[PDB]
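Deviations from the work plan: none for this task. Representative record:
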Amino acid sequence: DELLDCGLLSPVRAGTPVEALVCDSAWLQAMLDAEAALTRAQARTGFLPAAAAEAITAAARADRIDLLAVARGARETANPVVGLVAALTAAVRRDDPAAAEYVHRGSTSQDVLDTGAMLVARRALRLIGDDLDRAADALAALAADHRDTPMAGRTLALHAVPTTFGLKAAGWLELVSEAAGRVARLRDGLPFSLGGAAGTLAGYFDPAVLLDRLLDAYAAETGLARPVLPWHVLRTPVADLAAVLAFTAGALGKIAVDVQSLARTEVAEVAEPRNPVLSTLIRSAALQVPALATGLTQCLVSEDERSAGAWHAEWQPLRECLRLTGGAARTAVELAAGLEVDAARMRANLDLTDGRIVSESVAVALTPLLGRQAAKELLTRAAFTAGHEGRTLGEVLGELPELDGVLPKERWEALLDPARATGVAGALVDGALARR
Amino acid sequence: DELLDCGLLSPVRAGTPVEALVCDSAWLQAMLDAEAALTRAQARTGFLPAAAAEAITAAARADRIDLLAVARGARETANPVVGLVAALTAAVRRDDPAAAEYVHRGSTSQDVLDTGAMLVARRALRLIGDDLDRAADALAALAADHRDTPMAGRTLALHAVPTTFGLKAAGWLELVSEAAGRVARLRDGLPFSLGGAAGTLAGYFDPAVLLDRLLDAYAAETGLARPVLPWHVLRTPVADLAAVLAFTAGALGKIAVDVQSLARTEVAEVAEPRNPVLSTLIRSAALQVPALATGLTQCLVSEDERSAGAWHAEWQPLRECLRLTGGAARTAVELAAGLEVDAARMRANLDLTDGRIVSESVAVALTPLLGRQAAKELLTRAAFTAGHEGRTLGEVLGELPELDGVLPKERWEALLDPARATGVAGALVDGALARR
Amino acid sequence: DELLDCGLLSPVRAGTPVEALVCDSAWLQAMLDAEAALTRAQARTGFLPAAAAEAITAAARADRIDLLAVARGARETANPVVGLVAALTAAVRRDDPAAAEYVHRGSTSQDVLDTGAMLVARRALRLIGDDLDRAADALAALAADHRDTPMAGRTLALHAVPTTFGLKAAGWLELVSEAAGRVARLRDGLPFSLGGAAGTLAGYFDPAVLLDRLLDAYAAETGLARPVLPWHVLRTPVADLAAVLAFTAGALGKIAVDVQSLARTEVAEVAEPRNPVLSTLIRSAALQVPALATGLTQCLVSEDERSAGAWHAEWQPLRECLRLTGGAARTAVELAAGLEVDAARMRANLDLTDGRIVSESVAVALTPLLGRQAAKELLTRAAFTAGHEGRTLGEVLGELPELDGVLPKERWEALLDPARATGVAGALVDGALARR
Amino acid sequence: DELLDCGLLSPVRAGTPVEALVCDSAWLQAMLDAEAALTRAQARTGFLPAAAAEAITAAARADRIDLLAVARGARETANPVVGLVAALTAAVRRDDPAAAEYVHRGSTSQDVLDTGAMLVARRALRLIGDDLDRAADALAALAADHRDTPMAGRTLALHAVPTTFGLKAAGWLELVSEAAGRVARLRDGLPFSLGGAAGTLAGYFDPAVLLDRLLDAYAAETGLARPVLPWHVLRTPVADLAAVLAFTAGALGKIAVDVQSLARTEVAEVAEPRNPVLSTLIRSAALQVPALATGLTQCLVSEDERSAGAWHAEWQPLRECLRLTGGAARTAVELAAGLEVDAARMRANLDLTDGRIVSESVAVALTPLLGRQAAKELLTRAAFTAGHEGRTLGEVLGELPELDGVLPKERWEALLDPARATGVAGALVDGALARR
């Protein structure tokens, strides 16, 4: 039928857990959760009877509600909360006519919708963070295992100097760990929305005493944070979600394009657990989320006490950012857990420039006996000459009169070995891993 | 259930016709249409039997296929076409085992998916264009009716000089008409995708003769345009859809913010057919589509013969651009057909600056008798003085010695009438409407 | 001449201090600062003579260098550091031929360019943060002064319920204070770049001991933070700058569109220190920075050990984000310091809906005597009837039999007074201001 | 000094001709050109003396004006035209006091600024189009020369089937030719801006007769197109520039990433005229322009008769899009003219998958003797087995009993030759080149 979203156009998240958390029914449920938490908190502060709150809570179930009718009725007010409230009120009235007068008491559409949005975000970010933690575990393992696995460092698409795959993986780990930390902190900071019609909370009511009691109760009932001010037009939580999800998707995209560079036919230094489809999916989300994030970020420009459109522009892209990033994280776990590292092919590929990739380290080694300027000039000359003649760097070095007898044979064998010129990659990996 | 997309987060398109054209099932159907058209065209050029094409065509129905299984299986290849092909092949094999060997003959995932994407786009743009035409009809009617309806022209949020609502509406008409023309031409130019594994069409086969015959047949079977080259990495149709849909959404967004400016409480010069929810919905799409369009446009950077991610990043945002823009167009029709213009309130609001809004036209009128520089200086002085004293511009003018007896009384009454200083707005509306 | 950038196209920053911090000459100077700090730190750890570091430091002045030649020579390597290094080396060699062999010792283009970029960012963010602090001071003053200044709360462009300008200004304050805090923390966290050719630091050299000593020395010489890992392809600082500057520009944009809504001709509740040009300029930056930020954020996808283009795409938009946001902040200070609040016009505008804006608070007041449902129904009926008849809400209320003798006259006079139905706006302002 | 823009942060355009066309002084000159054209056209239609127009034209030179003062004074009105007009008026008054009364007669800031913007765009697009034409010439030459140069087609980063470099280059040609055509048509369609204070042209004046005469004269004096309506808030030309420049930058970005894929160390099939810096620069612009374009496109949402910020947000990004795209085009010419194609290395790389890259073409060849299903199964089996055993595809084929004596030896030698399985790449190149 025409109502099914199966993820047909978005394989990066199709079949992944985040789908179930951010589908339309889950958002309907989140808005019902926000209503019932509102009633319960109002009862806890004395504004209505506890039994009416229990009845509303019991009726506040997505299966009591006609999802399609609510969605299709929203065009009349440009949001779904008026229809939702009517449906919940009828559902409560069926079982408890006294309780129905307290459904949505003193409230406004945006408190319920935004509170539900932060509930959905909070649950979805719990999943994204747990997946980022698993990915980080597999990456830290790859980093420790390959601390001493040499490979060609590549800059501007060409071999530069040798590095280690452990160092590369530790950069991956650094990105994923940063993302998981930001996801956790953002999750702990998402607030409820309790402002009333235009942010004065007039319908919900020393004014300071009652404000404090109600705000504490609604924090307790929702599990969300208490904000200093109603934020109907202070869209900091939405901008923060946009920033954190675009950072996360971009970091995973970094891992994805590195994997694709290593996995291509004529490199073949890693393989995915034979197209590299996992990195293709991660990359697909990486090319989508930042553009959605900029629309989210632009909605900070929200006029008056409720914008005539900029708030409405937030819901779908936010959901999609949660969905895509969720898929990408799940896919990243599969990638980092399953990556196949071909150390021997990395070692072989180190020889592709016929010694030129160690010329910097040879220049350094010759600096005590030649000077820095003379050694650098001699080595760039030898690298060019070896490139033209299709000979090894060491071959051209063994023909320059200036180098005759300059170093013992064994030291030359050590110097021209690409696997030994990795700088301090080992110490850097140790330092990154001690942070865990 | 968790699979329902009801438009709960996107009221601008919930319940509108475009939904049915661009849902997941409609895309599945479009890919089946592309397969069956491929078989039929191959039969028309002699590469397989006509009966096998009829059998495949008959089986190529979305209700023969498990949508959810195809979507969930796509993670193995990062696209849904391999699973789709297996399901269609089984469905054909049930009724006709000989025909099943010709399902997806010589083809590749991207020919089918991209061809289906252009089928979906073509049908969705048929709807968007027809709606833009209806909106343009209502706007041209508003433009003709209010050719002589005076109102305050507003620049940088303040009254500037008088204009007419007919001229404003004719600008609306100009934008919508431009969009409808671009939608129609783009629709007539969307091509099929027939490239094979890496753009050589090797599996489908003077090579020029067979190429021409097959390309003509596939054009006939699909109704899509024949491209000069396979475009698996030449993403011009996608960039063009992105450009046209973002232009359309932005134009409708212009109408929406104008309506909101006119409809606010302390202006009240128009009303929607009492929050202005239609313009809120149009604006909501206007704040979403250009950001999706930039991701689409960036996918022009598609490496090799098939990108490992940038092509995959296109499907969902493209669908969403079609969906949102579709909603916005439908909503725009409702807005332009139902707008309530309060001419009397426009006339009253013209007097809000106490004559200052005609000071430019008074300066012009005094230029024969004072000079341009002296008249401009005198009128800015009088506008300031009238602003401070809370008096009419004409009051301050009737106290300057330099103006004593400068113009007859009746000419002053004509000059200070805001409804008569509209420039050539009437001629401009006539010129815009003669274009129809 | 053709080399002048005077801000002709960007008045929001033309003539503001940030220009001088982020112009081309300032970036040249920052890269020279990064070179000289590198030499000094290498001398402090024992790798070269202290006198050579003093000579390089003395020569490392933008006026010793041909800016235009460096910029125009950069096309050969796609960055300006090779030309810069040659020019600094010649300049040192003129005065001290021994010191010139240590210019750019063991270094790479990206360490110098990225370190200079973080120096520029750090200085520019010092200015942005100080300006945001001044703006926050003026906003907190407006919030305290107008805690009890009543005005129409506006939602979806229409009067909703009354609020106070103090509450509005306190939301402005909340945004600016959040931005200033994030700017300060980001500034304290920007790191230097010290990676070498491909992130192993091979040219700069227990390996852990020497790493730690050099990293500490370079932190001391630059004043920048020490990162856990070389970040040539771990673009977290750039993404963080993008996020913080787009948040800042959007927050200021919120203030700007609120000011424009209040300042328009038929509202006139505030005036800028007579077009509202300051808010126009702030808004102009708000519509630019988030789009630049998304390109910055997308550069997290940086392949290999140095991207062939994505790193190069960062410099100009980053500079522009610093520049625009800087202008916007400076302009925001001028706006918040100079805003003219017309309390009497706010009070008058409260009466524009002829009492309908207090109907919610009347419904609440009648709930003890009528019930919630009956009171809400009665008041929406009376609001409609009063709208049609062009009469006051209280007029229609005084004609319904159901309300006869329901409340004493004085209580009705209090109830229909828009200035008294502000909810708990006062307590909310007190709570926001106690945070200072 | 602090005013120099040398392109230090943007090597893709530093030292290229477009800089001189779009610098601040060039925009000042364009606005002076728009003023003088306005005076001349007004004289041609009879509204002022021809001699006053000649005097204004003679004084309307950027070297008569203080650029820095105009730019810095613009903060008072949020645009530079009031200061420009004062400076031009003084300059005319020095030589001709009578002519100075006709400077900026009946005009408004936006007519002059937007007309100058379209003058700058028109000249810059002349350059961009000529460069795109040169690039297209070199690409068509590469396409003809390498029509028969075989190479590995690569999809999702792996060898797929063989293609030709001629076909690849012909796709490059198709993109560049499309861009050059769109640039030329857009250039021929850019209009002047002549609206007056709020789009009625009241200050400039059968009203239809005078409108037509003045509009024709201003078209003649500017060389720009005559629009149907004043477009102060109908931002179609700006959106069109945004679309065309982002398309152009993305197309060139496609060529750039293809070059980088071919040029990397372990592929080495092409080389740039030894880092690939030209493609790095093109790519750098490709990652910048679409994000700037989305801000431009969003400015279609321009409220009232002149937006309080959205028009102001256009100037700098538009200039930058012109600048970057200009650089990219110039760089693309250098790249396409200088590319070094290593056909022998392409042929060698075809053998990297040990025959697996022809397995599809072997399957086709066996279909008459085995069936399609059986041949495909046999070849995927043989490809896997050959992959595991590190043997050639033909080796594993020569061991299956089912293939014994199936084809003569010579036919096997032809079949397993990667250079002969290119599909109809030759015919496709012929067809693309016949379009010239």
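Chain C touches chain A through 88 residues (CB under 8 Å).
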